[PDB]
Short mmCIF file of C-alpha atoms in Angstrom, two decimals:
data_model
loop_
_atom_site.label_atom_id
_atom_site.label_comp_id
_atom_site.label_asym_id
_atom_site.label_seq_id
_atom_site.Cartn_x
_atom_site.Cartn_y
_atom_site.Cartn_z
CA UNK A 2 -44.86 24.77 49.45
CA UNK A 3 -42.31 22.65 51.19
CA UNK A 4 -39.74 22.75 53.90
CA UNK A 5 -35.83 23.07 54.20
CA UNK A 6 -34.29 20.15 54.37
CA UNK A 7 -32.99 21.71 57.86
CA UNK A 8 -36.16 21.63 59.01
CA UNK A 9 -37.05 18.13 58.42
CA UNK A 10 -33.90 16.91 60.10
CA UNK A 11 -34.46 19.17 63.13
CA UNK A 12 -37.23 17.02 63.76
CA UNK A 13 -35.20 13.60 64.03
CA UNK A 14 -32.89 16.11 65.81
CA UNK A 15 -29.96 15.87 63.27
CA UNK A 16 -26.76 17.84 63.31
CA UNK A 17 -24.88 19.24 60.60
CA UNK A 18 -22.07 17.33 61.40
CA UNK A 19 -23.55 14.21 60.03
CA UNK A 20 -25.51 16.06 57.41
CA UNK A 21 -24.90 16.17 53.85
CA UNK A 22 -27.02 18.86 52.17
CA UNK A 23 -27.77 18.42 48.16
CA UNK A 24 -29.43 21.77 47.54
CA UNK A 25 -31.89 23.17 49.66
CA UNK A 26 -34.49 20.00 50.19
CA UNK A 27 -32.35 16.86 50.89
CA UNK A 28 -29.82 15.87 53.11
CA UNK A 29 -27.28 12.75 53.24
CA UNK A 30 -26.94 11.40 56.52
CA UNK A 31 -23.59 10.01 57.77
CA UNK A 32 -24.55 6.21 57.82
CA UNK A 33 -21.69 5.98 60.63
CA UNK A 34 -24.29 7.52 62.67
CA UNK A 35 -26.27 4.41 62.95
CA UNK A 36 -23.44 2.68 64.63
CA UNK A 37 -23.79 5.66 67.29
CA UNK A 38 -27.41 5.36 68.07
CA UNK A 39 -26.50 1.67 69.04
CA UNK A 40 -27.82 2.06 72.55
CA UNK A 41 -30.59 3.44 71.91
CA UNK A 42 -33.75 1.93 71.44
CA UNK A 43 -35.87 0.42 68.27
CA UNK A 44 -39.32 1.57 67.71
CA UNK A 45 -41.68 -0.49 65.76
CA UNK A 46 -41.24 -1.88 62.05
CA UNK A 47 -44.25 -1.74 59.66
CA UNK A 48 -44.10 -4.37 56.46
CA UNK A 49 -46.05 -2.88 53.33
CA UNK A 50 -46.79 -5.41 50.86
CA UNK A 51 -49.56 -6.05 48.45
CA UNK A 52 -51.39 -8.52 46.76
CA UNK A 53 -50.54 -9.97 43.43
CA UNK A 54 -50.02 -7.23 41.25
CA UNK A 55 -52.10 -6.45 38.04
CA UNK A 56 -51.94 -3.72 35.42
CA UNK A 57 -54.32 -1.99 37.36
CA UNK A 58 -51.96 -0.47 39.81
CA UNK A 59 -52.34 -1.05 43.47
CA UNK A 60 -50.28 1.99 44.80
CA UNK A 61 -48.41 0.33 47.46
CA UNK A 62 -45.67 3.62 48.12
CA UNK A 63 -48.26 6.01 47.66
CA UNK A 64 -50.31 3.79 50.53
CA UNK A 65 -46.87 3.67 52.36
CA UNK A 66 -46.30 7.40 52.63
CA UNK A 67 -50.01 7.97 53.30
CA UNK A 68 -49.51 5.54 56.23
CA UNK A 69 -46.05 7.25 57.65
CA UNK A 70 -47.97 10.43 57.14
CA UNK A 71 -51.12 9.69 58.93
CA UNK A 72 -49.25 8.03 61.76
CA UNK A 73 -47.31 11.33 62.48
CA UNK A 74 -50.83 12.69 62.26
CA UNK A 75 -52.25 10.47 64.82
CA UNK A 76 -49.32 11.62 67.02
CA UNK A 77 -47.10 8.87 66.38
CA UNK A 78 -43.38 9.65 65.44
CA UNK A 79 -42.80 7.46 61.85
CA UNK A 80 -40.72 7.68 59.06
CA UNK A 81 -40.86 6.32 55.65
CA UNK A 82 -37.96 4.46 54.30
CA UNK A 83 -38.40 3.75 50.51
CA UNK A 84 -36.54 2.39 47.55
CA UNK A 85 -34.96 4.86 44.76
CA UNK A 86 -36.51 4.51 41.25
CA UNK A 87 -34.40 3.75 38.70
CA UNK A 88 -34.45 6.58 36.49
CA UNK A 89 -34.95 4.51 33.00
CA UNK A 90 -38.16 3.46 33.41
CA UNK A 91 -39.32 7.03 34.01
CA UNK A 92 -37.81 7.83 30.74
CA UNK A 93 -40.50 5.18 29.40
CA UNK A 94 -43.26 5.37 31.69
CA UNK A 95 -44.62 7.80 34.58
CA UNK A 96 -44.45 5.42 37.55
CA UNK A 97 -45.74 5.63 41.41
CA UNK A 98 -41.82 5.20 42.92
CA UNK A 99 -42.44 8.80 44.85
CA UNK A 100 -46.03 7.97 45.31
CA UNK A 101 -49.25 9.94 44.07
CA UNK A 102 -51.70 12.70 44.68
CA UNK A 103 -51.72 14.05 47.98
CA UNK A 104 -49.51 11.13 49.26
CA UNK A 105 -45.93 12.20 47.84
CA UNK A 106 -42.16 12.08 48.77
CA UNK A 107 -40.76 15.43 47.98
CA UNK A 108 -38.78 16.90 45.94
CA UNK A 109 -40.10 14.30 43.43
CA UNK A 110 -38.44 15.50 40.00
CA UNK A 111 -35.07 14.93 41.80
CA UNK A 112 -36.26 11.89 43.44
CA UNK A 113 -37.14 10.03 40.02
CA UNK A 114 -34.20 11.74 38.19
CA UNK A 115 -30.11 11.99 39.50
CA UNK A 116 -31.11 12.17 43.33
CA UNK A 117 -28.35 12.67 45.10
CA UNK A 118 -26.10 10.72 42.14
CA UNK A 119 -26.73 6.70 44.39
CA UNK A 120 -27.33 4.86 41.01
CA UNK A 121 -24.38 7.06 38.89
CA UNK A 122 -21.94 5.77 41.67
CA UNK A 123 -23.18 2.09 41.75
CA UNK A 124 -22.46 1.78 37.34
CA UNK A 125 -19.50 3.91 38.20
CA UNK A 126 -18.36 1.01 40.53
CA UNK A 127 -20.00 -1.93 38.25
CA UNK A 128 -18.28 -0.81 35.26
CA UNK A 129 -15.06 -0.43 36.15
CA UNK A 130 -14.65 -3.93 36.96
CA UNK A 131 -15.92 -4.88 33.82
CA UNK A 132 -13.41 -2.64 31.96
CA UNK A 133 -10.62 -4.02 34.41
CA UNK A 134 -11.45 -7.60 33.36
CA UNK A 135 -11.40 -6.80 29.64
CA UNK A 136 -8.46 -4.89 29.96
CA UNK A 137 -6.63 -7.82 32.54
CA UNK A 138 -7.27 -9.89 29.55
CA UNK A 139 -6.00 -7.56 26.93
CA UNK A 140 -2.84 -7.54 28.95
CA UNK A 141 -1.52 -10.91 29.10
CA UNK A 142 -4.72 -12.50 30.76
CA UNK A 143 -2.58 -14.03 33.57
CA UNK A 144 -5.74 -15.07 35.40
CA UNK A 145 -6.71 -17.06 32.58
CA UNK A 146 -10.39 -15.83 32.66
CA UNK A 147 -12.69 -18.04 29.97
CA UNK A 148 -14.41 -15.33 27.84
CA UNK A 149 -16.90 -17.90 27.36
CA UNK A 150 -17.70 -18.03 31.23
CA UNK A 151 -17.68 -14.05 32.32
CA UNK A 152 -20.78 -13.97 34.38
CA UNK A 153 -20.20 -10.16 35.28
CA UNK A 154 -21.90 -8.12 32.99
CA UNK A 155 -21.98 -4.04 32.22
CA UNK A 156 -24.76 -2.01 33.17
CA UNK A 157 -27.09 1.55 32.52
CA UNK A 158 -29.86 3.35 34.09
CA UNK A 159 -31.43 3.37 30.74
CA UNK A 160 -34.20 0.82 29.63
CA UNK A 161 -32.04 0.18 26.00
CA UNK A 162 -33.21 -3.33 24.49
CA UNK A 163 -29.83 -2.74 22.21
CA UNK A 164 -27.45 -3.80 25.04
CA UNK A 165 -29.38 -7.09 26.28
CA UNK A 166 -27.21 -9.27 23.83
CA UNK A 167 -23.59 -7.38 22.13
CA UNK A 168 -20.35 -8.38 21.46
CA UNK A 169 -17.16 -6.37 22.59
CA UNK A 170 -13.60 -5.70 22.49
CA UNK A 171 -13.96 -5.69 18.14
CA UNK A 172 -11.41 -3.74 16.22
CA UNK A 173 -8.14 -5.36 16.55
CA UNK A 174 -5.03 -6.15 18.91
CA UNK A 175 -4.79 -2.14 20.29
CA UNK A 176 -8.99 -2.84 21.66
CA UNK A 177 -8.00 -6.42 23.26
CA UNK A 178 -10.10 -9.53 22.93
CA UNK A 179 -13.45 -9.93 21.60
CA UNK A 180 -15.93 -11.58 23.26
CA UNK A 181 -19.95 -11.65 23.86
CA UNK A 182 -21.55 -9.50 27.07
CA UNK B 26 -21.42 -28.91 -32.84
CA UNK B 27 -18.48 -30.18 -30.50
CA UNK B 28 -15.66 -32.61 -30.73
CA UNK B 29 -15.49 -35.51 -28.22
CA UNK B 30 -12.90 -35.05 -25.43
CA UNK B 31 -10.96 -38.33 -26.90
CA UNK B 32 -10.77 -36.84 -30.68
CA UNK B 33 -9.21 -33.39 -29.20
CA UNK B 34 -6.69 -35.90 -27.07
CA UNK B 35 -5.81 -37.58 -29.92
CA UNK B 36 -4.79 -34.79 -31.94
CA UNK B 37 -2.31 -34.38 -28.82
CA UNK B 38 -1.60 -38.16 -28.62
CA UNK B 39 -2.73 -38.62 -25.50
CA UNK B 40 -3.59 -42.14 -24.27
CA UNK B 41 -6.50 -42.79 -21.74
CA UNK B 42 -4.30 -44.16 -19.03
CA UNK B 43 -3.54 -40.46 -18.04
CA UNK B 44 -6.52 -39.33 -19.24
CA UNK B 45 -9.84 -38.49 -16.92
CA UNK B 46 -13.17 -37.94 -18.39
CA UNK B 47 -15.47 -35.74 -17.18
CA UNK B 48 -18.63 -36.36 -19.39
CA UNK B 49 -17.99 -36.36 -23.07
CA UNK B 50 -16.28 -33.43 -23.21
CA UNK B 51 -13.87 -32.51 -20.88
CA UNK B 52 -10.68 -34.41 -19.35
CA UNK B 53 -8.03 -34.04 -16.86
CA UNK B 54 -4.18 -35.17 -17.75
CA UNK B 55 -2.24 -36.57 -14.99
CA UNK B 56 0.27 -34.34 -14.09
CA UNK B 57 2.90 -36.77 -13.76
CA UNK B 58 3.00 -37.05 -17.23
CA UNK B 59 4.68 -33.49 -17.92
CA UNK B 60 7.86 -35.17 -16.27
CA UNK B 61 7.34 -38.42 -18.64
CA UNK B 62 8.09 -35.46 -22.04
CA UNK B 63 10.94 -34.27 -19.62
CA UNK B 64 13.33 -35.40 -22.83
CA UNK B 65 11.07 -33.90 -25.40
CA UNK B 66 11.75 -30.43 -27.24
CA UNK B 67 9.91 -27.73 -25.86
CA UNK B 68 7.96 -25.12 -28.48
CA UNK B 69 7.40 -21.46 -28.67
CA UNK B 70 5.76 -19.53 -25.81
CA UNK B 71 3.40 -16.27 -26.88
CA UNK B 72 2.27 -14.15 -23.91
CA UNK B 73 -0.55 -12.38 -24.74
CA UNK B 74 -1.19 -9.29 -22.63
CA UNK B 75 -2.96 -5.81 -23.09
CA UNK B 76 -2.99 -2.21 -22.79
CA UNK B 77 -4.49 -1.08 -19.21
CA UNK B 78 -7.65 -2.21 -19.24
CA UNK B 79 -11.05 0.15 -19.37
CA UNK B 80 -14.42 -0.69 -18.77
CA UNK B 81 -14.99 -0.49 -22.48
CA UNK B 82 -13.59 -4.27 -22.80
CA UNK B 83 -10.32 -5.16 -24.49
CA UNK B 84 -11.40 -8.66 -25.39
CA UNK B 85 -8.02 -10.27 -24.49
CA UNK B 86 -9.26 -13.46 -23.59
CA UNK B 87 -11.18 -13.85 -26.85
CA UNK B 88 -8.00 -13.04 -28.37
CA UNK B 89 -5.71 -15.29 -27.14
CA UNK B 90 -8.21 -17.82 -27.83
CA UNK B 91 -8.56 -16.81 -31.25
CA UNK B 92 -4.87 -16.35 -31.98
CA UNK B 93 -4.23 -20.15 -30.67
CA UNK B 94 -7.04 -21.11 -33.28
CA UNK B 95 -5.12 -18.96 -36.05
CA UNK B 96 -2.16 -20.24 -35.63
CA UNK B 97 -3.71 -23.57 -35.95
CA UNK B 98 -5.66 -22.93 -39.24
CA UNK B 99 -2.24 -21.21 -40.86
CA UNK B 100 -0.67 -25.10 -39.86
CA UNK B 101 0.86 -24.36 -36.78
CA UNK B 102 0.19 -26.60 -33.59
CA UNK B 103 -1.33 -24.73 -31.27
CA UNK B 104 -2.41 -24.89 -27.41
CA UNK B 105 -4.20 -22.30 -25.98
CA UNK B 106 -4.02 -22.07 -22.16
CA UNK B 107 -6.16 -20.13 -19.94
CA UNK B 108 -7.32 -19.73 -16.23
CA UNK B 109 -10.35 -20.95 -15.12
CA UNK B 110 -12.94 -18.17 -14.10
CA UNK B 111 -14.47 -17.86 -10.90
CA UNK B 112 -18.27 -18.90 -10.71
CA UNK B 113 -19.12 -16.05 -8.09
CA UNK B 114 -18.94 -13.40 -10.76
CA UNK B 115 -20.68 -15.24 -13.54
CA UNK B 116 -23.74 -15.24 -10.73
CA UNK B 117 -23.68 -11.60 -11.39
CA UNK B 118 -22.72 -10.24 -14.42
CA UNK B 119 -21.68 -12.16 -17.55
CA UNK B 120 -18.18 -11.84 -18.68
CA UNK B 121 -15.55 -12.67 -21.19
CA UNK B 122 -13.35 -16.06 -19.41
CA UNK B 123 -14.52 -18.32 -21.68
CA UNK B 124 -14.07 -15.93 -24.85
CA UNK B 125 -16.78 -15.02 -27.00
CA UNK B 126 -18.65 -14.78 -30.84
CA UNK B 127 -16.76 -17.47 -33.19
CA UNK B 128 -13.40 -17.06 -30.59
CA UNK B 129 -14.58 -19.41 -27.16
CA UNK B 130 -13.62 -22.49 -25.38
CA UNK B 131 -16.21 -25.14 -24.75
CA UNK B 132 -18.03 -25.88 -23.42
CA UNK B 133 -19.08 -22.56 -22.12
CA UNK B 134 -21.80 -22.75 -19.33
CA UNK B 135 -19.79 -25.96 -17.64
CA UNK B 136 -15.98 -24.15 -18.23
CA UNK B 137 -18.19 -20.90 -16.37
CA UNK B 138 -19.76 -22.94 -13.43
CA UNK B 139 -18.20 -26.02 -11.71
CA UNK B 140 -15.97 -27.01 -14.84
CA UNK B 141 -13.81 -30.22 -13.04
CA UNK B 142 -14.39 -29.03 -9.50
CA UNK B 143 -10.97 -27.43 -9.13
CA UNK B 144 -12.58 -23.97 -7.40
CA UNK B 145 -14.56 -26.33 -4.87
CA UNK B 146 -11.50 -28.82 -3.98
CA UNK B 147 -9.27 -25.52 -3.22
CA UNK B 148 -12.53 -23.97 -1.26
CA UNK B 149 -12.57 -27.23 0.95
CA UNK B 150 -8.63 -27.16 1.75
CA UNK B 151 -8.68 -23.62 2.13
CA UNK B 152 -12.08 -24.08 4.58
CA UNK B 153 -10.56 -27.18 6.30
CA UNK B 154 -7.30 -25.11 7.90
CA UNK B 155 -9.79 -22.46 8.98
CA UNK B 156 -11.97 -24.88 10.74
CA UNK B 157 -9.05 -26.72 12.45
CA UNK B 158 -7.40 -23.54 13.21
CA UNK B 159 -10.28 -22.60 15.42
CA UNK B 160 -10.98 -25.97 16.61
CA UNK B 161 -7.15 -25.89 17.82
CA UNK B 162 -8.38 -22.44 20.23
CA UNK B 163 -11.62 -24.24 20.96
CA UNK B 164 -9.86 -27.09 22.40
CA UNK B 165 -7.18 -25.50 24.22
CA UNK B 166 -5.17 -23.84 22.36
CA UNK B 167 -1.37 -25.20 22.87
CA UNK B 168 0.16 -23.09 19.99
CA UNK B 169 -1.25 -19.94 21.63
CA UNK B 170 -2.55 -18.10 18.41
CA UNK B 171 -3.77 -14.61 18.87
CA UNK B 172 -6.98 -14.26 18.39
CA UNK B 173 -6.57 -10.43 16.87
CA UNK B 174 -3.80 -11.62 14.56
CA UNK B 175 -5.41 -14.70 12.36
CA UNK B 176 -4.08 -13.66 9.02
CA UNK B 177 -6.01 -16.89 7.31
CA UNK B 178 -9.26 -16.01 6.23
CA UNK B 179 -12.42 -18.54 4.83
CA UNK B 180 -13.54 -18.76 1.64
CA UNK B 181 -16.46 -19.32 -1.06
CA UNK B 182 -16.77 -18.85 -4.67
CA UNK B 183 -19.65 -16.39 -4.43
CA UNK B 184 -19.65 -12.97 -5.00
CA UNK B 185 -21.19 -12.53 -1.15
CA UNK B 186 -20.16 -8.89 0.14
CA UNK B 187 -21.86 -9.68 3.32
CA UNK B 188 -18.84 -11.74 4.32
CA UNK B 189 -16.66 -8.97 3.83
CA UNK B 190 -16.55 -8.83 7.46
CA UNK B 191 -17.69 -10.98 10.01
CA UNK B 192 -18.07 -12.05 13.91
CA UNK B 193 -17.49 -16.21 14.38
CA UNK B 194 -17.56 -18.35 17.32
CA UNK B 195 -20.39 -16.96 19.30
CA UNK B 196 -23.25 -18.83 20.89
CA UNK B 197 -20.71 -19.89 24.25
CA UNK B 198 -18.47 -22.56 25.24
CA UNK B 199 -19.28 -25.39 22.99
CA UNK B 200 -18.45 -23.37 20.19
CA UNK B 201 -15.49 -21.99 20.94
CA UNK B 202 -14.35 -18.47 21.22
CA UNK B 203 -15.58 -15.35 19.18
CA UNK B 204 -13.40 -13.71 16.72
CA UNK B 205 -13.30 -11.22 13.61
CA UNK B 206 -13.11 -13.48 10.22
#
């Protein structure tokens, strides 16, 4: 029962030009365009926080929505600016990342799951240098890395236990260098 | 019902200045004094071999030892000589090194286990390069040895499959650097 992503950024009176649509419900915004709005003026910053959390579950985002929401409500222009959830807890555990009830960011199955592909491009990135320091070594090593003092490790959106402690580059000369990550 | 080590060297006319008792029963000869007979006639040599060998059991070992104790009792001087059997497989099955019925040498259960030591002092050599070799990487490695092509393995006299194949040098920097043994 929700609205076009069009809709939503007709509000903040976005244009296509700096719009990235992913489907019919989110957009990308050109992050270029902050350097635009320069000028222009800041409105007011709201902190949520929380006390010391417990296993009772506080539901600080679905408090920060409700508060964006009923702000709007009140007449006052707000947005909501939020963290993405990692999608391997939710593979564990239902969490409150997109909030709760009748407090929600929308759409929220996309939201906890690939999004708009953020965390697939940051192990993408991570990754690579981890298989272009193996690989470095396998080559000659001419940096003379220590494989006894890589502090860059690999990295998942997956809670896996498995990969907390491994050891690499096994199964001779053609696979390079062993050592632990 | 056993012979003392000195009675068996006398029948050889061997003196005790190149002879080394271990317990009553068993001595090593200094090998220097092969070269001492270097003027003396050599005798006959009888290989004793087999027809390929199925797990029914051939008995060769019994055999030889027999034959040497035949030749003997028809007055012919005779020397049997035999390799000494590993312990590891003793640990798990019993076999036929040390002969068997009326045709053994004795005695038996020390010949089978740690006999004069000779399996351990070639373990501890054998163990020693290993330990230097990767004490050389540890420390710096000036001969540049490749990691991937270590063609020296380690050793025990154990029948231990779980060694088969191995990870070393893990744990970080004070223990060197990881590798396949």
């Amino acid at each position: 029962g929700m609205k076009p992503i069009k809709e939503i950024a007709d509000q903040l009176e976005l244009k296509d030009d700096i719009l990235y649509p992913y489907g019919h419900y989110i957009a990308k915004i050109d992050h270029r365009f902050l350097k635009s709005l320069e000028n222009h003026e800041d409105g007011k910053l709201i902190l949520v926080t929380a006390v010391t959390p417990t296993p009772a579950g506080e539901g600080k985002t679905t408090t920060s929505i409700g508060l964006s929401m009923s702000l709007n409500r009140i007449g006052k222009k707000s947005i909501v600016t939020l963290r993405e959830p990692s999608l391997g807890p939710t593979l564990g555990l239902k969490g409150g990342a997109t909030g709760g009830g009748r407090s929600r960011v929308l759409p929220s199955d996309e939201i906890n799951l690939h999004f708009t592909g953020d965390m697939h491009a940051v192990a993408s990135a991570h990754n690579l240098l981890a298989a272009v320091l193996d690989s470095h070594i396998k080559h000659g090593n001419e940096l003379k890395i220590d494989i006894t003092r890589v502090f860059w490790k690999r990295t998942m959106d997956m809670n896996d236990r498995a990969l907390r402690s491994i050891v690499i580059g096994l199964g001779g000369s053609a696979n390079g260098f062993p050592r632990e990550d």
